[PDB]
Amino acid sequence: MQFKVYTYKRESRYRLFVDVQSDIIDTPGRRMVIPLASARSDKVSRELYPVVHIGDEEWRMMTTDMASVPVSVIGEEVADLSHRENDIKNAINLMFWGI
């Protein structure tokens, strides 16, 4: 579901992803997601890589590592980032349409 955060059931580069696909766009067995990296370089653009807060820690939304995942790898839902829809939307639009 769009803006919900999930763990990977199978080991990936990162440990969390946010679903960014529209809830009325149907891809049977898959969803478009952006991985979240532990925020641990400060000067990297916050416009393209928003900082979000999950499990009492900072994470960078790795916008340029966007990829589809099969539902078979989608594990527990850990959080909802719908309150950050404005920065998520700004980041996604910047990556394709910037300047």
Place this chain on the structure above:
Amino acid sequence: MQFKVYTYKRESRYRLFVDVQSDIIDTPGRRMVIPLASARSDKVSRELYPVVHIGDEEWRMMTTDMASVPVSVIGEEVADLSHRENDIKNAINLMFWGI
């Protein structure tokens, strides 16, 4: 480069991808791309999966298989789809923001 079509140097599900990343968005060593599938089911949405023409054949832009690729896998440039920027933009925006 945005809207340019390339072959994969290493075997992938598909054989072509279109660069969809802005030319002023810098991801050292990588680019955001959408694979092209040989068009060979007709009733699949042309709004979400545009039909394009390369090497005298029809291809579907596999919008929901969007992923980053390392420059190391980017082979020969085979075509330019900049003339289809309107349908490509419509498809990408539909996948995130549809309804």
